[PDB]
Coordinates of C-alpha atoms in Angstrom, one line a residue:
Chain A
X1 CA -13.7 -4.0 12.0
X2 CA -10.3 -5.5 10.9
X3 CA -10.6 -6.7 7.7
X4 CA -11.0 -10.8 7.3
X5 CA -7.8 -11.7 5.6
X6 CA -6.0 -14.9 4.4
X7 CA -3.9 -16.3 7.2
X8 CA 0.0 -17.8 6.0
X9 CA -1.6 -20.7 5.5
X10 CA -4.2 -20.0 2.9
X11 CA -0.9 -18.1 0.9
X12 CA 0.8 -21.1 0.9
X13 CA -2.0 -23.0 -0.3
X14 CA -2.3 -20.4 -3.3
X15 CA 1.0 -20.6 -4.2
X16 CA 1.2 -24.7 -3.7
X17 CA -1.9 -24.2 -6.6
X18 CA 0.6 -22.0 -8.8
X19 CA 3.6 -24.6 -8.8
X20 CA 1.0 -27.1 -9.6
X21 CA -0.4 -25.6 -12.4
X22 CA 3.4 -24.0 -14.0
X23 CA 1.5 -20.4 -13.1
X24 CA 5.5 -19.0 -14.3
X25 CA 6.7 -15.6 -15.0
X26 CA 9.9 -14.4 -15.9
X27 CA 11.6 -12.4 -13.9
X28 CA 14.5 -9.8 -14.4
X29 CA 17.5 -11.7 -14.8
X30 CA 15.2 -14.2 -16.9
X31 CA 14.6 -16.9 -14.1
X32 CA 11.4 -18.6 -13.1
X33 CA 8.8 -17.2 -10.4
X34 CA 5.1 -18.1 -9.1
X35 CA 3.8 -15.4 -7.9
X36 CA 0.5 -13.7 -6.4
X37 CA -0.3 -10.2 -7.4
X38 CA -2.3 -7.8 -4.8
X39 CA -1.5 -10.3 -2.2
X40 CA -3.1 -9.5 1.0
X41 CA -3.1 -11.4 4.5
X42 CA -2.5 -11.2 8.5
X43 CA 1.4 -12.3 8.9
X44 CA 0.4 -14.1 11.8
X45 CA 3.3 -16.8 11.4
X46 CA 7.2 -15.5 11.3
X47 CA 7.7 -17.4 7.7
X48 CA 6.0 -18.6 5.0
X49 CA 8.4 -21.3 3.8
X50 CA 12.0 -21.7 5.1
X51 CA 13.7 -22.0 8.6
X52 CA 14.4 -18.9 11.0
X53 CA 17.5 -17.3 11.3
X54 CA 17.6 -15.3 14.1
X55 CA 21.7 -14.8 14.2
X56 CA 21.2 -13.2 10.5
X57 CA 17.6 -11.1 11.1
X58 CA 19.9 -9.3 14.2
X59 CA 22.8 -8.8 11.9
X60 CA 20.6 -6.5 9.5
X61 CA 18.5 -5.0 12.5
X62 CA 22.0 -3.7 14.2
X63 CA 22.5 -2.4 10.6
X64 CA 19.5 -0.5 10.4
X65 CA 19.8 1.3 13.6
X66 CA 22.8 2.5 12.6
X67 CA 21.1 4.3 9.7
X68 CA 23.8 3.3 7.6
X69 CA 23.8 3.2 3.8
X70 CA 26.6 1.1 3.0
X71 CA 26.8 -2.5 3.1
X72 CA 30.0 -2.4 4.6
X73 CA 28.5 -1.8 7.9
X74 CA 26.6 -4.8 8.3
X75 CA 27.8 -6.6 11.2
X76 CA 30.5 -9.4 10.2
X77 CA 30.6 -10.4 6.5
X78 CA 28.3 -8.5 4.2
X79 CA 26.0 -11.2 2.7
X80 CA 25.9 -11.6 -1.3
X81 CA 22.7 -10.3 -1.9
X82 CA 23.2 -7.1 -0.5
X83 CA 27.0 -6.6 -2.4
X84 CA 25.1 -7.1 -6.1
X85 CA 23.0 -4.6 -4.9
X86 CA 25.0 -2.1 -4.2
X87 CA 26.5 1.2 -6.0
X88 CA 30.3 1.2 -7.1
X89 CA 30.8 3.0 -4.0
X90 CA 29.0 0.0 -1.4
X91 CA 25.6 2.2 -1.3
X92 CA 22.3 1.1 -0.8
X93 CA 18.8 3.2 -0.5
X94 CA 17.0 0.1 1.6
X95 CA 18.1 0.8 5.0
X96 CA 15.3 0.1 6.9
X97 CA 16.2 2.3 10.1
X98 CA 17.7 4.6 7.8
X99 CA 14.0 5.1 6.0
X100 CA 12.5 5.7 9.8
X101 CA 15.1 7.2 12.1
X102 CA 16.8 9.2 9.8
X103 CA 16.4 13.3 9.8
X104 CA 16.8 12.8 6.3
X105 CA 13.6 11.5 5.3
X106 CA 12.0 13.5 8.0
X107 CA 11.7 11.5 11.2
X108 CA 9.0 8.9 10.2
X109 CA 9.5 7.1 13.7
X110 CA 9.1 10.2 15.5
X111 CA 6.4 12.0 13.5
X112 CA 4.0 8.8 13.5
X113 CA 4.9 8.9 17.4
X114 CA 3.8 12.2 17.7
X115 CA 0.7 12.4 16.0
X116 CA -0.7 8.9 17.5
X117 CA 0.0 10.5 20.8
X118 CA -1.9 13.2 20.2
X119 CA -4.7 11.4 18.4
X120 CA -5.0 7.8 19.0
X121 CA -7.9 7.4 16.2
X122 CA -5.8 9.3 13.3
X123 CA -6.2 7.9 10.1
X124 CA -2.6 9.6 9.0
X125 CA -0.2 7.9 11.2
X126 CA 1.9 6.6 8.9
X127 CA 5.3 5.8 8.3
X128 CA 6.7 6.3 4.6
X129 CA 9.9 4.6 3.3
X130 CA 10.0 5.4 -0.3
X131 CA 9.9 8.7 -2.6
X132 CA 8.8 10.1 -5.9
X133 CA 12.8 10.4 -6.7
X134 CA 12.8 6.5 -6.3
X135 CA 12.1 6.6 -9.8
X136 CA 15.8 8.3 -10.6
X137 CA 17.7 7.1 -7.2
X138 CA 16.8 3.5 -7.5
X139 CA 20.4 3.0 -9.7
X140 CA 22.5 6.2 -8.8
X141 CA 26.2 5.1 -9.0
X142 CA 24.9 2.0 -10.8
X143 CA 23.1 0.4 -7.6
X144 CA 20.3 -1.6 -8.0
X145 CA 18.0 -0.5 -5.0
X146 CA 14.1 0.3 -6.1
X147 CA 12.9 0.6 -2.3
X148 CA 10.8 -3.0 -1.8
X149 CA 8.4 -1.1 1.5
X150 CA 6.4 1.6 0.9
X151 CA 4.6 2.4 3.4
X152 CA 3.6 1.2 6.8
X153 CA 0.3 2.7 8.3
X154 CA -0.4 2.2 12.5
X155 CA -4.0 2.2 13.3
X156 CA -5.3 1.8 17.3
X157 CA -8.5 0.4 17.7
X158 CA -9.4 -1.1 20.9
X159 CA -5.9 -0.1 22.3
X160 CA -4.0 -2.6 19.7
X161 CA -2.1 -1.1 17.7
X162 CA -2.4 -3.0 13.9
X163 CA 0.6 -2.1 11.0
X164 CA -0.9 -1.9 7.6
X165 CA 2.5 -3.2 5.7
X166 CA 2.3 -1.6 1.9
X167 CA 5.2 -3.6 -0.6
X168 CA 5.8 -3.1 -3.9
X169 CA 7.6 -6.7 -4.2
X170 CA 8.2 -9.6 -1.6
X171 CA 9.6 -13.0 -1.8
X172 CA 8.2 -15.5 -0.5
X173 CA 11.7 -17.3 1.3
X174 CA 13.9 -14.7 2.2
X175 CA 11.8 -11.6 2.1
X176 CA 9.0 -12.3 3.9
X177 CA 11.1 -13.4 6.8
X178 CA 13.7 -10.7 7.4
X179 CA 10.9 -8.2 6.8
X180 CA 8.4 -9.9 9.2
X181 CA 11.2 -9.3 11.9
X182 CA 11.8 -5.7 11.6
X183 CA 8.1 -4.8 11.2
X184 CA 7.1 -6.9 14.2
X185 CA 10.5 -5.3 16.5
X186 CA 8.9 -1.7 15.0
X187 CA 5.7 -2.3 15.9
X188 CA 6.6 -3.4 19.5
X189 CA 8.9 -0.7 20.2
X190 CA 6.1 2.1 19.6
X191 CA 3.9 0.2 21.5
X192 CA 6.5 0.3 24.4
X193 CA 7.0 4.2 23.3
X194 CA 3.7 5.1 23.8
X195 CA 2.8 3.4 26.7
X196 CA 6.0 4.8 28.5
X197 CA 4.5 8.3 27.3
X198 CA 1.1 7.8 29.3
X199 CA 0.5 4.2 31.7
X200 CA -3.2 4.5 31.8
X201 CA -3.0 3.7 27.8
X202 CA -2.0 0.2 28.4
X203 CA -1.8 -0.3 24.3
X204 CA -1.0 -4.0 23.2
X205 CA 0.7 -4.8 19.4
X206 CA -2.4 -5.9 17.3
X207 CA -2.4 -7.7 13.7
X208 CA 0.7 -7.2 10.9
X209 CA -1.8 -7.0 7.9
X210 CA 0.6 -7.4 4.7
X211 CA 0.2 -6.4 1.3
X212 CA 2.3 -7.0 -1.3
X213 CA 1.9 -5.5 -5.3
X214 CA 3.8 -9.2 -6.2
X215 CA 4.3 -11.7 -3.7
X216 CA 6.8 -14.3 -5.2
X217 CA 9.1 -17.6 -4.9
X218 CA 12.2 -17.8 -7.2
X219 CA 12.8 -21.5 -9.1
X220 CA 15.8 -21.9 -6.8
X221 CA 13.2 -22.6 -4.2
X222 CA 10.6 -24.5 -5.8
X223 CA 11.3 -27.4 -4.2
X224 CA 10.2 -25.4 -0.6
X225 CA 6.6 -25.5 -1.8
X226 CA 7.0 -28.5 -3.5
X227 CA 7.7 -30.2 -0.4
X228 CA 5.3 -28.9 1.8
X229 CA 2.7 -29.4 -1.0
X230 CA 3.3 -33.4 -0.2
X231 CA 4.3 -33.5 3.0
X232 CA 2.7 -30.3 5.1
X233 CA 6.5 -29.7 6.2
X234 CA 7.4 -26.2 5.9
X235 CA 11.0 -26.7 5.2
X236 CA 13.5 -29.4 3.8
X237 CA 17.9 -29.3 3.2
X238 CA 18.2 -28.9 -0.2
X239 CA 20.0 -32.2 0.5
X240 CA 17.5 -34.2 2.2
X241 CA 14.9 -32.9 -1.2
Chain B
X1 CA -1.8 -15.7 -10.0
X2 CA -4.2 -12.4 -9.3
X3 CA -5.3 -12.8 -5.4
X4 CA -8.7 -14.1 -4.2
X5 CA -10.1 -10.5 -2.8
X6 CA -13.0 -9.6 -2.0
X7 CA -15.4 -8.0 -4.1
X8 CA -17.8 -4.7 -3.9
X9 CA -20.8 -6.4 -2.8
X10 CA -18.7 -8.2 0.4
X11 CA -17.6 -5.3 1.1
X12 CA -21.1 -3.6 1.1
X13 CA -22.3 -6.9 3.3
X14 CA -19.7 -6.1 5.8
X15 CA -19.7 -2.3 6.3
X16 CA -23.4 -3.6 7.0
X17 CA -22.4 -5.8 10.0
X18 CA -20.2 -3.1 11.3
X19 CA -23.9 -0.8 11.3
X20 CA -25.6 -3.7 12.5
X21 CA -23.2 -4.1 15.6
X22 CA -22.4 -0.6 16.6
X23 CA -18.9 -0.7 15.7
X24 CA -18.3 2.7 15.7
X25 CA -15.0 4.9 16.1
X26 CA -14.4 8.3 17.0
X27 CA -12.9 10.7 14.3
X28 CA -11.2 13.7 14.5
X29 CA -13.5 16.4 14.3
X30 CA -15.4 14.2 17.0
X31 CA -18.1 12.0 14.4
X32 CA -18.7 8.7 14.7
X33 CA -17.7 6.3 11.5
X34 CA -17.8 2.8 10.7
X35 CA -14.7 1.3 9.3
X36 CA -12.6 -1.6 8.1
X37 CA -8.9 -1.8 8.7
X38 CA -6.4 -3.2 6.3
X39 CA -9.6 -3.0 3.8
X40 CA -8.4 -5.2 0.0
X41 CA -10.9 -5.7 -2.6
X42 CA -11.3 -5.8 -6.3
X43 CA -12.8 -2.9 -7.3
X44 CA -15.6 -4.3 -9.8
X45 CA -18.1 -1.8 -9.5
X46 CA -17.9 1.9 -10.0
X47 CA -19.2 2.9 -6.5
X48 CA -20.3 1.4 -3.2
X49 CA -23.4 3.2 -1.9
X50 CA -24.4 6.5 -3.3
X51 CA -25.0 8.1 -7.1
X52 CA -22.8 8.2 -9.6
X53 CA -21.8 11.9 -10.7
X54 CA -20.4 11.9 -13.7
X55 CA -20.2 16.1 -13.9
X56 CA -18.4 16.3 -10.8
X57 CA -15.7 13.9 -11.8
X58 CA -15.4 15.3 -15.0
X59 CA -14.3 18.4 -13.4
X60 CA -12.1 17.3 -10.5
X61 CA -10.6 15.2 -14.1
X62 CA -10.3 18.5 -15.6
X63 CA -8.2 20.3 -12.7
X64 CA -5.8 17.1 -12.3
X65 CA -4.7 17.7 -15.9
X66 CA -3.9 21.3 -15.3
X67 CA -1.6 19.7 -12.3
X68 CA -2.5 23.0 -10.2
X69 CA -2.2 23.2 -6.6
X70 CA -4.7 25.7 -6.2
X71 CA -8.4 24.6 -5.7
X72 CA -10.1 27.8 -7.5
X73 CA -8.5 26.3 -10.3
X74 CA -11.1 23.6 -10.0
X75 CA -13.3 24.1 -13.1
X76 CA -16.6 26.2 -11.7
X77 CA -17.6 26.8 -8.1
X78 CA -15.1 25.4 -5.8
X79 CA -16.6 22.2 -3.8
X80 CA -16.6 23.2 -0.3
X81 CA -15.2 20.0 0.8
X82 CA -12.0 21.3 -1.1
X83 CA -11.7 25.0 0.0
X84 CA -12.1 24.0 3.9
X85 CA -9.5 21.9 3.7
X86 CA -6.9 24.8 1.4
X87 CA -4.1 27.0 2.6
X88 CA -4.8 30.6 3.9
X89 CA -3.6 31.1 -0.1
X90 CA -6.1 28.2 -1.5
X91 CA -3.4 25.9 -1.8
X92 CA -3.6 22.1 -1.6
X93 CA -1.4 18.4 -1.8
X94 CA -3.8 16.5 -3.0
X95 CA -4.0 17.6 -7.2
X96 CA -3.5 13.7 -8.2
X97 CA -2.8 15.0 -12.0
X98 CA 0.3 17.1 -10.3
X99 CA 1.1 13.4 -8.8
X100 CA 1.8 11.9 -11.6
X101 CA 2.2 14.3 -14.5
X102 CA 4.4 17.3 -12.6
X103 CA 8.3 17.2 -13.0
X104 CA 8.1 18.5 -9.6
X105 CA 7.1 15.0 -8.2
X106 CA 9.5 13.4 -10.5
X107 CA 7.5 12.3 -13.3
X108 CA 5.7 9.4 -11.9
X109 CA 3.8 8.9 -15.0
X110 CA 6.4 9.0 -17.6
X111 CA 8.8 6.7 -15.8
X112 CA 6.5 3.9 -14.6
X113 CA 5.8 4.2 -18.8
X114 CA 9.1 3.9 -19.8
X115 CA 10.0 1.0 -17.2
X116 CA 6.9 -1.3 -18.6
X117 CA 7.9 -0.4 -22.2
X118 CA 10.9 -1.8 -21.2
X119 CA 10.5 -4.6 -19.6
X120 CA 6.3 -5.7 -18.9
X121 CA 7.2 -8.3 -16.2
X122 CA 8.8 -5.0 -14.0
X123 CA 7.6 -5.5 -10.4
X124 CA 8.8 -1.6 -10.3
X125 CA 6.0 -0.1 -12.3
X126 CA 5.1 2.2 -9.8
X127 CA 3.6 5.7 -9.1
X128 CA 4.3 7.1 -5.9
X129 CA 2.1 9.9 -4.8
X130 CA 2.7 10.6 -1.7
X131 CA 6.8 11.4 -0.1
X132 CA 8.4 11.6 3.3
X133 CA 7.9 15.1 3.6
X134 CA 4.1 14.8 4.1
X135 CA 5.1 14.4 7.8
X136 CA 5.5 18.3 7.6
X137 CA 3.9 19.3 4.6
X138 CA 0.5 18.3 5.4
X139 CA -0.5 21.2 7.0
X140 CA 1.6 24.3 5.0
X141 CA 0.2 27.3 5.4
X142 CA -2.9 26.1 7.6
X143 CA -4.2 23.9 4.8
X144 CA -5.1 20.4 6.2
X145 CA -4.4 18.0 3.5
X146 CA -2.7 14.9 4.0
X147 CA -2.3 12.8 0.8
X148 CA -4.4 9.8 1.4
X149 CA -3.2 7.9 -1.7
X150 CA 0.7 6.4 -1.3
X151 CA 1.3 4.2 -4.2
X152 CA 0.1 3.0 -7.2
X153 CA 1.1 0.0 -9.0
X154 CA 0.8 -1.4 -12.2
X155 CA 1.7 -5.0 -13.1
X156 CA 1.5 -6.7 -16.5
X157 CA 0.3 -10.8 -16.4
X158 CA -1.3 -12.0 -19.3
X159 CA -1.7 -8.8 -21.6
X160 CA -4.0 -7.9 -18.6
X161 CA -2.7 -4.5 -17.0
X162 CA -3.6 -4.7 -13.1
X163 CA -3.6 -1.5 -10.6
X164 CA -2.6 -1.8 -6.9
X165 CA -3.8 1.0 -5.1
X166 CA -3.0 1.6 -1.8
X167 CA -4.5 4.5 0.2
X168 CA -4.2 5.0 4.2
X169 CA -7.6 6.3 4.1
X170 CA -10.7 6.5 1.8
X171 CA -14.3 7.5 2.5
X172 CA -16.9 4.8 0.9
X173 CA -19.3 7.3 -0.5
X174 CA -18.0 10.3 -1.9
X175 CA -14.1 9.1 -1.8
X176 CA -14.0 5.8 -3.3
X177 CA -16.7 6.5 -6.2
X178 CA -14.3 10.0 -7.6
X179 CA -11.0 8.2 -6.8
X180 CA -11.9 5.0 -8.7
X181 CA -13.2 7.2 -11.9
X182 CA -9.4 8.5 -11.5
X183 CA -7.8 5.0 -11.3
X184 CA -9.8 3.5 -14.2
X185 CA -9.2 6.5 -16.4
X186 CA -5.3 6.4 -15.6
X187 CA -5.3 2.8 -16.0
X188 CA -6.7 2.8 -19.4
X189 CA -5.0 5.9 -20.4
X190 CA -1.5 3.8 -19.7
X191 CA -3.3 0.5 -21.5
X192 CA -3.5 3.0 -24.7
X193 CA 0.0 4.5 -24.5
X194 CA 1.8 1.4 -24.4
X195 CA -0.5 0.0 -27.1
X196 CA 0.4 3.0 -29.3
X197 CA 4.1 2.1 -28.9
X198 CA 4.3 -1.0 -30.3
X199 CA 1.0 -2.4 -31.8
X200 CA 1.9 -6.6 -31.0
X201 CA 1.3 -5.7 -27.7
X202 CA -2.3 -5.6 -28.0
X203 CA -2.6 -4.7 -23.6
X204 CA -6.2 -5.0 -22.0
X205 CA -6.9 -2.8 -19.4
X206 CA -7.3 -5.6 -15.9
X207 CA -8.4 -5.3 -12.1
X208 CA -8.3 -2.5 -9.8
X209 CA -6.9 -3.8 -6.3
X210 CA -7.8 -1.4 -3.8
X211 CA -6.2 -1.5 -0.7
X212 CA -7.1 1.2 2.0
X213 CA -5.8 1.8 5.5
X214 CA -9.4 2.6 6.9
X215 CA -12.4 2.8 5.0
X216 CA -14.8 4.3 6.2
X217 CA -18.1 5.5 6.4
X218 CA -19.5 8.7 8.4
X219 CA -22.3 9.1 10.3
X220 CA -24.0 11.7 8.1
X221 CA -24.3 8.3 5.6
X222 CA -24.9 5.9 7.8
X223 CA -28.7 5.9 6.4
X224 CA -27.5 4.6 3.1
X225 CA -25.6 1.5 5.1
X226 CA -28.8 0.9 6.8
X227 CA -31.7 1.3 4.0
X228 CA -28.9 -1.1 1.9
X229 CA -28.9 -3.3 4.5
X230 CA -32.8 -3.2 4.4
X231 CA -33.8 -3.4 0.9
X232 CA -30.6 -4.3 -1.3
X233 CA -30.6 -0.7 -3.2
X234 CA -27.3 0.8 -3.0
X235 CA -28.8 4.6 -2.9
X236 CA -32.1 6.6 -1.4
X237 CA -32.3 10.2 -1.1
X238 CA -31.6 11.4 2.0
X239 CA -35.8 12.7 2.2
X240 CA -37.1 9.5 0.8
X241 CA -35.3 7.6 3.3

């Protein structure tokens, strides 16, 4: 049995409740958030709040299958948020393709491939992004990089495959989006993997169950859920507000 | 705002539909279980079906806080759930005292203490048990033991103290009821040390938000499912049944 979780909808119901009844905390730099702690729901819409991007979410997954660790290497112009982020010398620890593809943190692509192959019911296929010397790496060179994804678990049941998604921290806006992408392009591409390994498997991509230790908006986009608190409209120009 | 989960008793009501329906999954010795993917609920209740035993977690308590990776270290007569599953040397991954306490795992503990000493609102109070090397490590030496909790986090709202635990895997009888008495007694330990650093604090000790890959239930307790399901008490012996 998959579990019988909130849908995108009922989160953005919940956190429509917290901007209505100034549920605040104050986060890092000092700034407003709502936010919902142990969040857990099927991402079975792209977004949450916001528009789609797609020119942007390709940028970043070009970027992360080249494993690389500095911002620099983002395709075109290096976006804002990921140059405050980064060490004195343009280094990051979040790279995505980095955390999967890379021999450096032990093939997590290829070792989740491998033992699904070999055992289509395991409970232990399972890729892991961060590490116990997170706690010390997260600011080496004065970065400012505490790995956001955990882990990501791949269960087949009924030949869909379903990705547990395990966060430490998501926003709501920006977050949720870019993420959603990449776990949704990863999760079809070892569909497509292990089918090509065997075609009487005929596997299909299941549910994108996501949980998230704090789930959050930013004040800067308050008026998002504002908006769609009145109106139903998921989005609105800052302009048009 | 703390999420809407589920609580024990759902839980109990659906692992009881799962029975009801035959929903059954292979695992890999070949035993059938019953199971619930992507499984989140607040764990407000000490256990799910079974008996509490409180000697048996006192000494599996008692072996985490020597941190040693060695199961005859386990106070007494070895469980043989632990010594089937050790090294050809007795060896295991799974000490969850070593976890958190060992400088060898980089101190999860102590820095997850010293980041909400420093700031409460920290969405990077974390303890990360498991680490990319699992991929290989998981079967050292012929043992078979691949660490089924990932994360812990711990998030201050309200004085209140909340644990997000994510596991890929936890069995509802034995696993859930020893793993819990763990959490709770780690959670109130870290309610008590940050209380003993500054006494305006004054820190309460909040929800456990269990999060679990698949839990599940094999076929060897299946009758405590189904006499649950029957009569509405949560444990029979196995001859009275």
């Amino acid at each position: 049995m998959i579990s019988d979780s909130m849908t995108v909808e009922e989160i953005r119901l919940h956190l429509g409740l917290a901007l209505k009844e100034k549920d605040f905390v104050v986060d890092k730099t000092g700034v407003k958030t709502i936010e919902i702690i142990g969040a857990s729901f099927v991402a079975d819409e792209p977004f949450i709040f916001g528009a789609l991007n797609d020119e942007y979410i390709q940028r970043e997954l070009e970027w992360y299958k080249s494993k690389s660790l500095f911002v620099k290497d983002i395709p075109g112009e290096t976006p804002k948020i990921w140059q405050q982020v980064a060490s004195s010398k343009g280094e990051i620890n979040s790279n995505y393709g980095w955390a999967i593809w890379s021999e450096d943190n032990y093939a997590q692509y290829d070792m989740c491939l491998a033992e699904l192959g070999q055992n289509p019911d395991s409970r232990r296929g399972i890729m892991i992004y961060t590490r116990p010397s997170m706690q010390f790496d997260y600011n080496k060179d004065g970065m400012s990089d505490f790995m956001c994804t955990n882990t990501v678990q791949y269960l087949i049941r009924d030949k869909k495959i379903n990705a547990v998604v395990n966060m430490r921290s998501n926003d709501v806006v920006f977050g949720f989006r870019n993420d959603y992408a990449w776990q949704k392009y990863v999760l079809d591409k070892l569909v497509s993997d292990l089918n090509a390994g065997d075609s009487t498997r005929q596997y299909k991509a299941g549910s994108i169950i996501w949980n998230v230790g704090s789930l959050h908006v930013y004040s800067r986009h308050f008026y998002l859920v504002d908006h769609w608190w009145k109106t139903g409209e998921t989005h609105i120009s800052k302009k048009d507000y």
